Amino acid sequence: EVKLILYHWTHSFSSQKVRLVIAEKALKCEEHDVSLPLSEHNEPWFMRLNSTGEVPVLIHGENIICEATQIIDYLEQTFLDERTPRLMPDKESMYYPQVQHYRELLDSLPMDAYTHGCILHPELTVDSMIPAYATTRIRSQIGLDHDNVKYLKKILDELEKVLDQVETELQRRNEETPEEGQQPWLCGESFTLADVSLAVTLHRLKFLGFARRNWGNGKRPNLETYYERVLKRKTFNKVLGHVNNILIS
Amino acid sequence: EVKLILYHWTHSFSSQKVRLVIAEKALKCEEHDVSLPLSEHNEPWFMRLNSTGEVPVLIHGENIICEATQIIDYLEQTFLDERTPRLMPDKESMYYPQVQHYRELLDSLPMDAYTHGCILHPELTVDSMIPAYATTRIRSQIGLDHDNVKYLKKILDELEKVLDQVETELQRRNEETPEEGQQPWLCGESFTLADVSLAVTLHRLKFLGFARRNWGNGKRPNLETYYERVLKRKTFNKVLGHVNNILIS
Protein backbone atom coordinates (compact mmCIF):
# COMPACT_ATOMS: atom_id res chain seq x y z
CA GLU A 1 0.00 0.00 0.00
CA VAL A 2 2.91 2.33 0.74
CA LYS A 3 3.90 3.86 -2.58
CA LEU A 4 7.37 3.75 -4.14
CA ILE A 5 8.24 7.03 -5.88
CA LEU A 6 11.34 7.87 -7.92
CA TYR A 7 12.58 10.99 -9.72
CA HIS A 8 15.35 10.73 -12.29
CA TRP A 9 16.64 11.40 -15.80
CA THR A 10 15.80 8.56 -18.18
CA HIS A 11 19.25 8.77 -19.80
CA SER A 12 21.28 9.41 -16.63
CA PHE A 13 23.84 6.68 -16.01
CA SER A 14 23.08 6.69 -12.28
CA SER A 15 19.34 6.47 -12.97
CA GLN A 16 19.75 3.51 -15.34
CA LYS A 17 21.36 1.33 -12.66
CA VAL A 18 18.61 2.15 -10.16
CA ARG A 19 15.79 1.56 -12.64
CA LEU A 20 17.29 -1.79 -13.61
CA VAL A 21 17.45 -2.88 -9.96
CA ILE A 22 13.76 -2.06 -9.56
CA ALA A 23 12.91 -4.18 -12.60
CA GLU A 24 15.11 -7.06 -11.44
CA LYS A 25 13.45 -7.10 -8.01
CA ALA A 26 9.97 -6.95 -9.61
CA LEU A 27 9.14 -3.86 -7.55
CA LYS A 28 6.16 -1.65 -8.37
CA CYS A 29 7.46 1.92 -8.63
CA GLU A 30 6.06 5.32 -9.61
CA GLU A 31 8.81 6.57 -11.91
CA HIS A 32 8.97 10.24 -12.95
CA ASP A 33 11.30 11.14 -15.82
CA VAL A 34 11.88 14.81 -15.02
CA SER A 35 14.12 15.19 -18.08
CA LEU A 36 12.66 17.27 -20.93
CA PRO A 37 13.02 16.52 -24.66
CA LEU A 38 14.32 20.03 -25.43
CA SER A 39 16.64 22.04 -23.21
CA GLU A 40 16.48 25.78 -22.61
CA HIS A 41 19.29 26.02 -25.17
CA ASN A 42 17.07 23.94 -27.51
CA GLU A 43 19.20 20.82 -27.10
CA PRO A 44 18.31 17.11 -26.92
CA TRP A 45 19.39 14.66 -24.23
CA PHE A 46 22.39 13.34 -26.18
CA MET A 47 23.85 16.87 -26.19
CA ARG A 48 23.67 17.55 -22.44
CA LEU A 49 24.59 14.46 -20.42
CA ASN A 50 28.01 15.26 -19.00
CA SER A 51 27.49 16.30 -15.37
CA THR A 52 23.95 17.55 -16.12
CA GLY A 53 22.72 14.05 -15.35
CA GLU A 54 23.50 14.09 -11.64
CA VAL A 55 21.69 12.28 -8.80
CA PRO A 56 18.23 10.63 -8.62
CA VAL A 57 16.05 10.28 -5.51
CA LEU A 58 13.80 7.60 -4.02
CA ILE A 59 10.83 8.22 -1.73
CA HIS A 60 9.42 5.27 0.24
CA GLY A 61 6.91 6.44 2.83
CA GLU A 62 9.00 8.19 5.48
CA ASN A 63 12.36 7.55 3.77
CA ILE A 64 14.18 9.83 1.32
CA ILE A 65 17.29 8.41 -0.39
CA CYS A 66 19.22 10.22 -3.10
CA GLU A 67 22.34 8.87 -4.77
CA ALA A 68 22.18 5.81 -7.00
CA THR A 69 24.28 3.46 -4.86
CA GLN A 70 22.46 4.52 -1.69
CA ILE A 71 19.07 3.89 -3.32
CA ILE A 72 20.04 0.41 -4.52
CA ASP A 73 21.31 -0.49 -1.05
CA TYR A 74 18.01 0.69 0.45
CA LEU A 75 15.96 -1.46 -1.92
CA GLU A 76 18.06 -4.52 -1.08
CA GLN A 77 17.74 -3.86 2.66
CA THR A 78 14.00 -3.12 2.61
CA PHE A 79 12.02 -5.41 0.29
CA LEU A 80 12.58 -8.86 1.78
CA ASP A 81 9.38 -10.66 0.76
CA GLU A 82 10.05 -14.23 -0.33
CA ARG A 83 8.82 -13.34 -3.83
CA THR A 84 11.33 -10.49 -4.18
CA PRO A 85 14.58 -11.63 -5.87
CA ARG A 86 17.80 -10.89 -4.02
CA LEU A 87 20.58 -9.15 -5.96
CA MET A 88 23.21 -9.85 -3.28
CA PRO A 89 24.01 -13.08 -1.41
CA ASP A 90 23.50 -13.04 2.34
CA LYS A 91 25.72 -10.59 4.20
CA GLU A 92 27.57 -13.41 6.01
CA SER A 93 27.76 -15.60 2.90
CA MET A 94 31.06 -17.15 1.84
CA TYR A 95 30.53 -15.70 -1.66
CA TYR A 96 29.47 -12.21 -0.54
CA PRO A 97 32.80 -10.29 -0.61
CA GLN A 98 33.56 -11.43 -4.17
CA VAL A 99 30.29 -9.91 -5.41
CA GLN A 100 30.85 -6.61 -3.60
CA HIS A 101 34.38 -6.50 -5.03
CA TYR A 102 33.37 -6.42 -8.70
CA ARG A 103 30.48 -4.09 -7.86
CA GLU A 104 32.72 -1.44 -6.30
CA LEU A 105 35.28 -2.02 -9.06
CA LEU A 106 32.79 -1.06 -11.77
CA ASP A 107 31.03 1.67 -9.76
CA SER A 108 34.38 3.46 -9.37
CA LEU A 109 34.93 3.98 -13.11
CA PRO A 110 34.83 7.68 -14.13
CA MET A 111 31.87 7.37 -16.47
CA ASP A 112 31.37 11.14 -16.60
CA ALA A 113 35.00 11.54 -17.71
CA TYR A 114 34.51 8.91 -20.41
CA THR A 115 31.46 10.84 -21.63
CA HIS A 116 33.37 14.12 -21.26
CA GLY A 117 36.27 12.82 -23.35
CA CYS A 118 34.17 11.20 -26.08
CA ILE A 119 32.50 14.45 -27.13
CA LEU A 120 35.82 16.29 -26.80
CA HIS A 121 38.13 13.78 -28.56
CA PRO A 122 36.17 11.65 -31.04
CA GLU A 123 39.40 10.43 -32.63
CA LEU A 124 39.84 8.04 -29.68
CA THR A 125 36.44 6.42 -30.37
CA VAL A 126 35.05 3.98 -32.93
CA ASP A 127 31.39 4.03 -34.03
CA SER A 128 30.41 6.68 -31.52
CA MET A 129 26.64 7.13 -31.43
CA ILE A 130 26.74 10.84 -30.55
CA PRO A 131 26.37 13.17 -33.56
CA ALA A 132 29.66 14.68 -34.67
CA TYR A 133 28.35 18.23 -34.25
CA ALA A 134 28.25 17.63 -30.49
CA THR A 135 32.03 17.98 -30.65
CA THR A 136 31.40 21.21 -32.57
CA ARG A 137 28.99 22.65 -30.00
CA ILE A 138 30.80 21.88 -26.74
CA ARG A 139 34.18 23.09 -28.01
CA SER A 140 32.63 26.36 -29.23
CA GLN A 141 31.57 27.10 -25.63
CA ILE A 142 35.18 27.82 -24.59
CA GLY A 143 35.30 31.40 -25.86
CA LEU A 144 40.37 17.36 -14.25
CA ASP A 145 37.67 18.95 -16.45
CA HIS A 146 40.10 19.67 -19.34
CA ASP A 147 40.86 17.94 -22.63
CA ASN A 148 44.26 16.32 -22.04
CA VAL A 149 44.51 13.42 -24.50
CA LYS A 150 47.15 11.76 -22.32
CA TYR A 151 44.70 11.86 -19.41
CA LEU A 152 42.12 9.94 -21.47
CA LYS A 153 44.51 7.30 -22.80
CA LYS A 154 45.49 6.95 -19.13
CA ILE A 155 42.02 6.20 -17.76
CA LEU A 156 41.11 4.25 -20.90
CA ASP A 157 44.12 2.05 -20.17
CA GLU A 158 42.84 1.89 -16.60
CA LEU A 159 39.49 0.77 -18.00
CA GLU A 160 41.14 -2.04 -19.96
CA LYS A 161 42.76 -3.24 -16.74
CA VAL A 162 39.34 -3.44 -15.06
CA LEU A 163 37.85 -5.29 -18.03
CA ASP A 164 40.79 -7.71 -18.02
CA GLN A 165 39.68 -8.73 -14.53
CA VAL A 166 36.10 -9.14 -15.76
CA GLU A 167 37.10 -11.16 -18.83
CA THR A 168 39.13 -13.43 -16.54
CA GLU A 169 36.28 -14.03 -14.08
CA LEU A 170 33.86 -14.66 -16.94
CA GLN A 171 36.42 -17.07 -18.39
CA ARG A 172 36.63 -18.71 -14.96
CA ARG A 173 32.82 -18.85 -14.96
CA ASN A 174 32.80 -20.40 -18.43
CA GLU A 175 35.18 -23.25 -17.63
CA GLU A 176 33.36 -24.22 -14.43
CA THR A 177 29.98 -24.31 -16.19
CA PRO A 178 29.10 -27.39 -18.27
CA GLU A 179 27.67 -26.72 -21.70
CA GLU A 180 23.93 -27.37 -22.16
CA GLY A 181 23.51 -26.23 -18.53
CA GLN A 182 22.48 -22.86 -17.14
CA GLN A 183 25.15 -20.32 -18.02
CA PRO A 184 26.14 -18.22 -14.97
CA TRP A 185 26.54 -14.47 -14.72
CA LEU A 186 29.59 -12.56 -13.46
CA CYS A 187 29.76 -13.88 -9.88
CA GLY A 188 27.56 -16.96 -10.04
CA GLU A 189 24.36 -18.56 -11.23
CA SER A 190 22.29 -15.56 -10.09
CA PHE A 191 22.00 -12.02 -11.41
CA THR A 192 23.61 -9.71 -8.83
CA LEU A 193 24.27 -6.01 -8.36
CA ALA A 194 27.68 -6.51 -9.98
CA ASP A 195 25.82 -7.63 -13.11
CA VAL A 196 23.60 -4.55 -12.87
CA SER A 197 26.74 -2.42 -12.84
CA LEU A 198 28.30 -4.39 -15.70
CA ALA A 199 25.27 -4.41 -18.01
CA VAL A 200 24.71 -0.67 -17.68
CA THR A 201 28.37 0.37 -17.84
CA LEU A 202 29.15 -1.74 -20.92
CA HIS A 203 26.05 -0.39 -22.66
CA ARG A 204 27.33 3.15 -22.07
CA LEU A 205 30.69 2.36 -23.66
CA LYS A 206 28.88 1.10 -26.76
CA PHE A 207 27.08 4.45 -26.86
CA LEU A 208 30.34 6.40 -26.61
CA GLY A 209 32.16 4.25 -29.17
CA PHE A 210 34.48 2.68 -26.58
CA ALA A 211 33.23 -0.86 -27.34
CA ARG A 212 35.21 -1.85 -30.45
CA ARG A 213 38.36 -0.85 -28.55
CA ASN A 214 37.69 -3.10 -25.55
CA TRP A 215 35.89 -6.26 -26.72
CA GLY A 216 34.76 -8.10 -29.82
CA ASN A 217 36.50 -8.96 -33.08
CA GLY A 218 38.48 -11.58 -31.15
CA LYS A 219 39.22 -9.45 -28.07
CA ARG A 220 37.73 -10.40 -24.69
CA PRO A 221 35.27 -12.90 -26.22
CA ASN A 222 33.66 -13.76 -22.88
CA LEU A 223 32.85 -10.08 -22.35
CA GLU A 224 31.30 -9.87 -25.82
CA THR A 225 29.11 -12.89 -25.06
CA TYR A 226 28.09 -11.36 -21.73
CA TYR A 227 27.03 -8.09 -23.35
CA GLU A 228 25.08 -9.79 -26.13
CA ARG A 229 23.26 -11.76 -23.41
CA VAL A 230 22.08 -8.80 -21.33
CA LEU A 231 20.77 -7.13 -24.49
CA LYS A 232 18.24 -9.98 -24.78
CA ARG A 233 17.41 -10.12 -21.06
CA LYS A 234 13.78 -9.03 -20.82
CA THR A 235 14.27 -6.84 -17.75
CA PHE A 236 17.19 -5.06 -19.44
CA ASN A 237 15.43 -4.52 -22.77
CA LYS A 238 12.30 -3.07 -21.14
CA VAL A 239 14.18 -0.49 -19.05
CA LEU A 240 17.26 0.23 -21.18
CA GLY A 241 16.26 -0.89 -24.69
CA HIS A 242 15.94 2.63 -26.12
CA VAL A 243 18.32 4.60 -23.89
CA ASN A 244 20.96 4.59 -26.66
CA ASN A 245 18.69 5.50 -29.60
CA ILE A 246 19.09 9.22 -30.28
CA LEU A 247 15.70 9.16 -32.03
CA ILE A 248 13.40 8.76 -29.00
CA SER A 249 14.17 11.39 -26.34
CA GLU B 1 3.89 27.17 -14.41
CA VAL B 2 6.79 24.86 -13.54
CA LYS B 3 5.93 23.33 -10.18
CA LEU B 4 8.10 23.47 -7.05
CA ILE B 5 7.97 20.19 -5.11
CA LEU B 6 9.58 19.37 -1.76
CA TYR B 7 9.74 16.25 0.43
CA HIS B 8 10.78 16.53 4.06
CA TRP B 9 10.09 15.86 7.73
CA THR B 10 8.12 18.69 9.34
CA HIS B 11 10.24 18.50 12.50
CA SER B 12 13.61 17.89 10.84
CA PHE B 13 16.11 20.64 11.62
CA SER B 14 17.38 20.63 8.03
CA SER B 15 13.82 20.81 6.70
CA GLN B 16 12.92 23.77 8.92
CA LYS B 17 15.67 25.97 7.46
CA VAL B 18 14.61 25.14 3.90
CA ARG B 19 10.91 25.70 4.57
CA LEU B 20 11.67 29.06 6.17
CA VAL B 21 13.68 30.17 3.13
CA ILE B 22 10.74 29.31 0.87
CA ALA B 23 8.42 31.42 3.03
CA GLU B 24 10.88 34.32 3.18
CA LYS B 25 11.23 34.35 -0.63
CA ALA B 26 7.43 34.18 -1.04
CA LEU B 27 7.80 31.09 -3.23
CA LYS B 28 4.85 28.85 -4.06
CA CYS B 29 5.85 25.29 -3.16
CA GLU B 30 4.17 21.87 -3.04
CA GLU B 31 5.34 20.64 0.36
CA HIS B 32 4.97 16.98 1.33
CA ASP B 33 5.49 16.09 5.00
CA VAL B 34 6.43 12.42 4.62
CA SER B 35 6.78 12.05 8.40
CA LEU B 36 4.07 9.96 10.09
CA PRO B 37 2.45 10.70 13.47
CA LEU B 38 3.19 7.20 14.81
CA SER B 39 6.34 5.21 14.10
CA GLU B 40 6.54 1.47 13.52
CA HIS B 41 7.63 1.25 17.17
CA ASN B 42 4.51 3.30 18.01
CA GLU B 43 6.52 6.44 18.76
CA PRO B 44 5.82 10.14 18.14
CA TRP B 45 8.12 12.61 16.39
CA PHE B 46 9.67 13.95 19.60
CA MET B 47 10.94 10.42 20.37
CA ARG B 48 12.72 9.75 17.06
CA LEU B 49 14.53 12.85 15.80
CA ASN B 50 18.20 12.08 16.35
CA SER B 51 19.63 11.04 12.98
CA THR B 52 16.23 9.77 11.79
CA GLY B 53 15.54 13.26 10.49
CA GLU B 54 18.13 13.23 7.72
CA VAL B 55 18.03 15.04 4.34
CA PRO B 56 15.14 16.66 2.40
CA VAL B 57 14.88 17.00 -1.38
CA LEU B 58 13.70 19.66 -3.83
CA ILE B 59 12.34 19.03 -7.32
CA HIS B 60 12.12 21.97 -9.75
CA GLY B 61 11.32 20.79 -13.26
CA GLU B 62 14.50 19.06 -14.44
CA ASN B 63 16.48 19.73 -11.24
CA ILE B 64 16.79 17.45 -8.20
CA ILE B 65 18.56 18.89 -5.14
CA CYS B 66 18.83 17.09 -1.82
CA GLU B 67 20.64 18.45 1.23
CA ALA B 68 19.33 21.52 3.05
CA THR B 69 22.21 23.88 2.28
CA GLN B 70 22.29 22.81 -1.37
CA ILE B 71 18.55 23.41 -1.71
CA ILE B 72 18.74 26.90 -0.20
CA ASP B 73 21.60 27.82 -2.52
CA TYR B 74 19.56 26.61 -5.50
CA LEU B 75 16.56 28.75 -4.53
CA GLU B 76 18.78 31.82 -4.17
CA GLN B 77 20.43 31.17 -7.54
CA THR B 78 17.21 30.40 -9.42
CA PHE B 79 14.30 32.67 -8.47
CA LEU B 80 15.52 36.13 -9.46
CA ASP B 81 12.24 37.90 -10.24
CA GLU B 82 12.23 41.47 -8.96
CA ARG B 83 9.37 40.57 -6.60
CA THR B 84 11.37 37.73 -5.00
CA PRO B 85 13.27 38.89 -1.88
CA ARG B 86 16.99 38.18 -1.81
CA LEU B 87 18.38 36.46 1.29
CA MET B 88 22.01 37.19 0.36
CA PRO B 89 23.64 40.43 -0.84
CA ASP B 90 25.13 40.39 -4.32
CA LYS B 91 28.02 37.97 -4.76
CA GLU B 92 30.51 40.80 -5.36
CA SER B 93 29.05 42.99 -2.60
CA MET B 94 31.32 44.56 0.00
CA TYR B 95 29.08 43.10 2.73
CA TYR B 96 28.77 39.60 1.24
CA PRO B 97 31.60 37.70 3.02
CA GLN B 98 30.41 38.84 6.45
CA VAL B 99 26.98 37.30 5.83
CA GLN B 100 28.41 34.00 4.58
CA HIS B 101 30.70 33.92 7.63
CA TYR B 102 27.94 33.82 10.25
CA ARG B 103 25.92 31.47 8.04
CA GLU B 104 28.66 28.84 7.86
CA LEU B 105 29.43 29.43 11.55
CA LEU B 106 25.90 28.45 12.59
CA ASP B 107 25.45 25.72 9.97
CA SER B 108 28.53 23.94 11.36
CA LEU B 109 27.09 23.43 14.85
CA PRO B 110 26.50 19.72 15.69
CA MET B 111 22.75 20.01 16.16
CA ASP B 112 22.29 16.23 16.02
CA ALA B 113 24.83 15.85 18.84
CA TYR B 114 22.99 18.47 20.90
CA THR B 115 19.77 16.52 20.37
CA HIS B 116 21.62 13.26 21.05
CA GLY B 117 23.01 14.58 24.33
CA CYS B 118 19.80 16.18 25.58
CA ILE B 119 17.85 12.90 25.63
CA LEU B 120 20.88 11.09 27.06
CA HIS B 121 21.93 13.62 29.75
CA PRO B 122 18.95 15.73 30.86
CA GLU B 123 20.89 16.97 33.89
CA LEU B 124 22.77 19.37 31.59
CA THR B 125 19.49 20.96 30.42
CA VAL B 126 16.96 23.38 31.89
CA ASP B 127 13.26 23.31 30.95
CA SER B 128 13.74 20.65 28.29
CA MET B 129 10.55 20.18 26.28
CA ILE B 130 11.12 16.46 25.58
CA PRO B 131 9.27 14.13 27.97
CA ALA B 132 11.52 12.64 30.62
CA TYR B 133 10.65 9.08 29.59
CA ALA B 134 12.50 9.69 26.32
CA THR B 135 15.66 9.37 28.41
CA THR B 136 14.15 6.13 29.74
CA ARG B 137 13.42 4.67 26.29
CA ILE B 138 16.64 5.47 24.43
CA ARG B 139 18.89 4.28 27.27
CA SER B 140 16.97 0.99 27.52
CA GLN B 141 17.92 0.25 23.89
CA ILE B 142 21.55 -0.43 24.86
CA GLY B 143 21.03 -4.01 26.02
CA LEU B 144 31.25 10.08 18.66
CA ASP B 145 27.82 8.47 19.16
CA HIS B 146 28.41 7.76 22.89
CA ASP B 147 27.35 9.49 26.09
CA ASN B 148 30.56 11.14 27.34
CA VAL B 149 29.49 14.03 29.56
CA LYS B 150 32.86 15.72 29.06
CA TYR B 151 32.26 15.61 25.31
CA LEU B 152 28.97 17.50 25.74
CA LYS B 153 30.32 20.16 28.10
CA LYS B 154 33.05 20.52 25.46
CA ILE B 155 30.78 21.25 22.50
CA LEU B 156 28.36 23.18 24.72
CA ASP B 157 31.30 25.41 25.64
CA GLU B 158 32.05 25.57 21.91
CA LEU B 159 28.44 26.66 21.39
CA GLU B 160 28.82 29.48 23.92
CA LYS B 161 31.87 30.70 21.98
CA VAL B 162 29.80 30.87 18.79
CA LEU B 163 26.97 32.71 20.55
CA ASP B 164 29.49 35.15 22.05
CA GLN B 165 30.33 36.17 18.49
CA VAL B 166 26.62 36.55 17.70
CA GLU B 167 25.88 38.57 20.84
CA THR B 168 28.78 40.86 19.92
CA GLU B 169 27.61 41.44 16.34
CA LEU B 170 24.05 42.05 17.54
CA GLN B 171 25.48 44.48 20.10
CA ARG B 172 27.41 46.12 17.26
CA ARG B 173 24.15 46.23 15.30
CA ASN B 174 22.33 47.77 18.26
CA GLU B 175 24.76 50.65 18.80
CA GLU B 176 24.84 51.61 15.12
CA THR B 177 21.04 51.67 14.87
CA PRO B 178 19.19 54.74 16.20
CA GLU B 179 16.20 54.06 18.40
CA GLU B 180 12.76 54.67 16.87
CA GLY B 181 14.28 53.54 13.54
CA GLN B 182 14.14 50.16 11.82
CA GLN B 183 16.00 47.64 13.96
CA PRO B 184 18.43 45.55 11.87
CA TRP B 185 18.92 41.80 11.86
CA LEU B 186 22.21 39.93 12.36
CA CYS B 187 24.18 41.25 9.38
CA GLY B 188 22.20 44.32 8.38
CA GLU B 189 18.83 45.89 7.74
CA SER B 190 17.67 42.88 5.70
CA PHE B 191 16.76 39.33 6.69
CA THR B 192 19.49 37.04 5.32
CA LEU B 193 20.33 33.34 5.26
CA ALA B 194 22.41 33.86 8.41
CA ASP B 195 19.19 34.97 10.13
CA VAL B 196 17.43 31.87 8.78
CA SER B 197 20.16 29.76 10.38
CA LEU B 198 20.01 31.74 13.64
CA ALA B 199 16.22 31.74 14.05
CA VAL B 200 15.94 27.99 13.49
CA THR B 201 19.00 26.98 15.52
CA LEU B 202 18.06 29.09 18.54
CA HIS B 203 14.52 27.70 18.44
CA ARG B 204 15.94 24.18 18.60
CA LEU B 205 18.00 24.99 21.70
CA LYS B 206 14.84 26.23 23.42
CA PHE B 207 13.27 22.87 22.58
CA LEU B 208 16.21 20.94 24.06
CA GLY B 209 16.43 23.10 27.18
CA PHE B 210 19.74 24.70 26.16
CA ALA B 211 18.25 28.22 26.15
CA ARG B 212 18.33 29.22 29.83
CA ARG B 213 22.02 28.24 29.84
CA ASN B 214 22.98 30.50 26.91
CA TRP B 215 20.81 33.64 26.98
CA GLY B 216 18.23 35.47 29.06
CA ASN B 217 18.03 36.33 32.74
CA GLY B 218 20.70 38.97 32.11
CA LYS B 219 22.94 36.85 29.86
CA ARG B 220 23.40 37.80 26.18
CA PRO B 221 20.48 40.28 26.22
CA ASN B 222 20.82 41.14 22.53
CA LEU B 223 20.43 37.45 21.67
CA GLU B 224 17.31 37.22 23.84
CA THR B 225 15.81 40.23 22.05
CA TYR B 226 16.66 38.70 18.67
CA TYR B 227 14.95 35.41 19.52
CA GLU B 228 11.82 37.09 20.89
CA ARG B 229 11.65 39.05 17.62
CA VAL B 230 11.74 36.09 15.23
CA LEU B 231 9.00 34.40 17.27
CA LYS B 232 6.66 37.23 16.21
CA ARG B 233 7.86 37.37 12.60
CA LYS B 234 4.89 36.26 10.52
CA THR B 235 6.91 34.08 8.15
CA PHE B 236 8.55 32.32 11.10
CA ASN B 237 5.33 31.76 13.05
CA LYS B 238 3.50 30.29 10.05
CA VAL B 239 6.21 27.73 9.23
CA LEU B 240 7.75 27.03 12.64
CA GLY B 241 5.08 28.13 15.13
CA HIS B 242 4.10 24.61 16.20
CA VAL B 243 7.30 22.66 15.52
CA ASN B 244 8.13 22.68 19.25
CA ASN B 245 4.68 21.75 20.61
CA ILE B 246 4.70 18.03 21.40
CA LEU B 247 0.89 18.06 21.16
CA ILE B 248 0.47 18.45 17.37
CA SER B 249 2.53 15.83 15.49
Residue numbers in the entry:
A (entry chain A), B (entry chain A): 23 to 165, 197 to 302
Share the article's original sentences.
The ganglioside-induced differentiation-associated protein 1 (GDAP1) is an integral MOM protein, proposed to have an auxiliary role in mitochondrial fission and fusion, possibly via redox-dependent interactions with cytoskeletal components. GDAP1 has two GST-like domains, followed by a transmembrane helix, which anchors the protein into the MOM. Structural data have shown a covalently bound dimer interface in GDAP1, and while dimerisation is a common feature in catalytic GSTs, the GDAP1 dimer is formed differently, with a unique interface having a central disulphide bridge between Cys88 from each subunit. We carried out structural and biophysical analyses on several CMT-linked GDAP1 protein variants and describe new crystal structures of the autosomal recessive R120Q and the autosomal dominant A247V and R282H GDAP1 variants.
The R120Q mutation is located close to the N-terminal end of the α3 helix. Due to the mutation, residue 120 loses contact with the α6-α7 loop tip at Cys240, whereby the hydrogen bond between the Arg120 side chain and the backbone carbonyl of Cys240 is lost. Arg120 participates in a hydrogen bond network between helices α3 and α6. Arg120 is not conserved in GSTs at the sequence level; however, an Arg residue from the neighbouring helix in GST reaches the same position and makes similar interactions to the same carbonyl group in the ⍺6-⍺7 loop. This is in line with our experimental data for both R120Q and R120W, which indicate minor changes in structure, but destabilisation of the fold. Also R120Q had a slightly different conformation, most clearly seen in the distance distribution.
